[PDB]
A paper describes a structure:
In this study we have designed and tested the properties of a new protein scaffold based on the OB-fold of the aspartyl tRNA synthetase (AspRS) from the thermophile Pyrobaculum aerophilum. We term these small, single-domain engineered binding proteins OBodies. To demonstrate the amenability of this new scaffold to engineering for new binding specificity, we developed a series of OBodies with increasing affinity to a model target protein, hen egg-white lysozyme (HEL). Sharing a common range of epitopes centred on the HEL active site, these OBodies were also found to be efficient inhibitors of HEL activity.
In the third and final phase of affinity maturation, six residues in L4 of AM2EP06 were randomised and selections from this library resulted in the isolation of AM3L15 (KD = 30 nM) and AM3L09 (KD = 3 nM), constituting 8- and 83-fold improvements in affinity over AM2EP06, respectively. The crystal structures of the AM3L15-HEL and AM3L09-HEL complexes were solved at 1.86 Å and 2.57 Å, respectively. In AM3L15 (KD = 35 nM) L4 has adopted a helical character, with no similarity to L4 in AM2EP06. The N-terminus of the helix in L4 is capped by a tryptophan cis-prolyl peptide bond (W86, P87). In this case P87 appears to make hydrophobic contacts with HEL, while W86 mediates an inter-molecular hydrogen bond. Two L4 residues (D91 and T92), although not mutated in this library or previously directly involved in binding HEL were recruited for close involvement at the binding interface. In a position similar to Q87 in AM2EP06, the sidechain of T92 makes polar contacts with OBody interface residues of the β-sheet face, while neighbouring residue D91 introduces an inter-molecular salt bridge with HEL. These new contacts are the product of L4 rearrangement brought about by this affinity maturation step.
Residue numbers in the entry:
A (entry chain A): 1 to 113
B (entry chain D): 1 to 129
The structure:
């Protein structure tokens, strides 16, 4: 029951503020900082890496458990609301606050050691 | 130790945080105010089994090791207790690694909520730096 992609990551723009989007692509970057955790999604090579913010106090608890199973290069589908209210423009331009994170496949990454 | 505002501004400046990753000094004083109220001993356990430590409330899951958080990464390679010291060197070094991780100061929820996009220079006003 994972939702169909509605937008390409490069189509996530401030104009979409306040609307629901579904993005689909791979995990380009993960940052776990405690109360904030950010997963960036890409769907085009050398393309956008749109940041999906999970913030304690804002994001439902279960999605933090999903974030915990994530790895770089995992293929995901994430449903969320676009936020682009100032001061978002100071850096990222957009943020996505998720309501669903689906993991389609976990990457078989081979540790270097 | 509880720093005074200007006392912290001076220490943070000494430690090379002024414009570190493009963030002016006020951002860092503002972040400490709203994360720890300038208290280097500030310790806050989260419902998720992680704890936040020190003047900038650095988290035990990825950043420092506190011996009790599952899935520990200790990316700063320090024990969490080092972030509780009267001396802010360990917190500053670990903060500089965090702010370089790819999300800038958005790694700090207090900074996002209270500081980002505000007149952060107000936090160092009146100091003589």
């Amino acid at each position: 029951v994972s939702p169909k992609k509605t937008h390409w990551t490069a189509e996530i723009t401030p104009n979409l503020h306040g609307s629901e989007v579904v993005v689909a692509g791979w995990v380009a970057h993960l940052g776990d900082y405690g109360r904030v955790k950010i997963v960036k999604v890409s769907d085009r090579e050398g393309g956008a890496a749109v940041p999906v913010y999970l913030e304690r106090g804002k994001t439902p608890d279960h999605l933090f458990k999903v974030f915990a199973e994530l790895s770089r290069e995992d293929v995901v589908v994430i449903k969320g609301i676009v936020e682009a209210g100032w001061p978002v423009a100071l850096d990222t331009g957009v943020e996505i606050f998720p309501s669903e994170i689906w993991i389609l496949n976990k990457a078989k990454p081979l540790p270097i050691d | 130790k509880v720093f005074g505002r200007c006392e912290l501004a001076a220490a943070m400046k000494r430690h090379g945080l002024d414009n570190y990753r493009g963030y002016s000094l006020g951002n860092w004083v503002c972040a400490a105010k709203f994360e720890s109220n300038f208290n280097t001993q500030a310790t806050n356990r989260n419902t998720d089994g992680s704890t936040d430590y020190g003047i900038l409330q650095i988290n035990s899951r990825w950043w420092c090791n506190d011996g009790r958080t599952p899935g520990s990464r200790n990316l700063c390679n320090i024990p969490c207790s080092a972030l509780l010291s009267s001396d802010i060197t360990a917190s500053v070094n670990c903060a500089k690694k965090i702010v370089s991780d790819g999300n800038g100061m958005n790694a700090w929820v207090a900074w996002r909520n209270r500081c980002k996009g505000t007149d952060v220079q107000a936090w160092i006003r009146g100091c003589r730096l």
